[PDB]
Amino acid sequence: PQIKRGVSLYSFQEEFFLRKMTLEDCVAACASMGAYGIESLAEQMMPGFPNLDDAFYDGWHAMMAKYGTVSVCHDMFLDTKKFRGRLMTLDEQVESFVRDIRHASRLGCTVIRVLNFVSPELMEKVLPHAEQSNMRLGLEIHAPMHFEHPWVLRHIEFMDRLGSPLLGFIPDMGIFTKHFPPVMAERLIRQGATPHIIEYIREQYDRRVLAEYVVGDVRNMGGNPVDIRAAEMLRHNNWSNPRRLLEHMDRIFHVHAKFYEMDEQDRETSLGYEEVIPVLKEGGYSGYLASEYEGNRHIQDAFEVDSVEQVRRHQRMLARLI
């Protein structure tokens, strides 16, 4: 088994947003780093979706042939709140999902990144449609959840009695945040957070004190709304057990190798990679680690986002840890 280096074009969302690099440019940049696996948000970089032209898909395949890249995962977004005042009927959600099922099949994608909030009933109804197209449906396991969360447990119990290998998981690396990310810390500090309380919160996160105790105490010591937001951040970011993946290695189709900051030594400051990549290696993982550059939101208002350099350092880190 080999862990393939991939990149989510999400990583370059900054440069794409300002019209500095096109989709062709993004795929070429990925090919430069040897990260031929390409994960795409059709709603992000492919305007006209789902009403794309056959010429678009021919051009996509021409791109991939030109750059030796392989389209791996398609990030589906289910807008259950499409209509104000109600939720999409499950029947409407079936056709909305069918759009991504067909789009991904035409693109050549093997997995669809289903959001963590989709009900297991919806994944049960779209399952036959997914088998028509041979498409893997991967529920995103992102923080504040893990492989032992009750919602994930209900997904598992729903897909254990369906017995379909097209239903599985895409774990995020945010469930392996062993330190409060420094980029988040300095962003909060320059948003008006008192530095000493921020150091307190970071130390509390290192001690795994519960988000409730941390919020209460930071409030007692005197914390601005930004500071209580920094404390609430502990609810989102969590450190799960890296070994829990070994139980669910078969249902892990894709890994969002997310990161926030890569220092000059090819080091991921906070997220736990030295502990997780060995777990995947001994788990027999054979998939893609899609570089999900996440620090661009945090180093945004006072720093120049160089997505390509950060993703390049991350790719080097991954290459070393693999």
Partner: protein, 123 residues
């Protein structure tokens, strides 16, 4: 998200009866106009009502009030929507501060996603 880029620079133009400018939603993907729960637009110290907002995406212009019907329409990522505001009083020539706050009805998020920007353009 992209809160420093919402109000595009060098985009303040004078439409007969109002002022138009380029806006990019503070979100990382294409979002339908129906999921734009709130788009608060301020042009030099006055919030523009929704009945005074017409969002032009591509060649399609939709009054922001009827955005719920415009579920199919998608605000493309990085696309500069021309957000015409029928300001009751004309903007006198010079420098004007435009600030837009965004609340998006994201389905996989318990509370609306909030972005904000306040730039100083001129016409």
């Amino acid at each position: 998200m992209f809160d420093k880029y919402i109000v595009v620079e060098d985009s303040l133009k004078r439409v007969p009866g109002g002022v138009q400018f380029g806006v990019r939603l503070p979100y990382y993907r294409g979002l339908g106009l129906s999921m734009v729960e709130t788009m608060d637009v301020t042009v030099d110290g006055e919030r523009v009502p929704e009945e005074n907002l017409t969002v032009t995406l591509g060649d399609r212009t939709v009054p922001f009030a009827r955005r719920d019907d415009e579920t199919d329409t998608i605000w493309n990522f990085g696309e500069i929507a021309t957000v015409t505001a029928r300001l009751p009083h004309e903007l006198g020539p010079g420098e004007h501060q435009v600030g837009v706050n965004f609340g998006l009805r994201i389905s996989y998020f318990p509370v609306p996603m909030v972005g904000q920007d306040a730039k100083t353009l001129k016409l």
